[PDB]
Amino acid sequence: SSILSEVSTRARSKLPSGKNILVFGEDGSGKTTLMTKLQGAEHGKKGRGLEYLYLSVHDEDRD
C-alpha cells in the first residue's frame, strides 16, 4: 500500500500563511479607518465588539 501516499508526501515547499494582527484603538480613533484603508476599502463597518478584516498580501516574486 501507500507508495502513492509517500510519493505524494514529498511536497516541494510552502508559502507563508496563517498570520494574525491584533490592535487596540480607543472608541472612534479611526482604527477602523486605518485598517480599511490598508486593504483599500474606504470604510468598513463601525460596530461594537471584536471586528474582522483582511490583508490581501500579494508578492510578485513568488507570484
Partner: protein, 48 residues
C-alpha cells in the same frame, strides 16, 4: 614574472566572460522564477 603575467592574461580572458556570465545569471533568474511560478517540482539534484 611569467607566472604573474599568466595570472593576469587569464583574468583578462575572464574579463570578457564576466558579462556573458552575468547575462546568463539574470536569464536564469528569469528561468528559475518562471519555473517556480510554473510550479515545477525541483529535483533533489537541482542546485539552488
Amino acid at each position: 614574472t611569467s607566472d604573474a603575467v599568466t595570472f593576469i592574461t587569464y583574468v583578462q580572458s575572464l574579463k570578457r566572460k564576466i558579462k556573458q556570465f552575468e547575462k546568463q545569471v539574470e536569464l536564469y533568474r528569469n528561468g528559475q522564477r518562471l519555473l517556480e511560478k510554473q510550479r515545477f517540482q525541483f529535483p533533489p539534484s537541482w542546485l539552488y
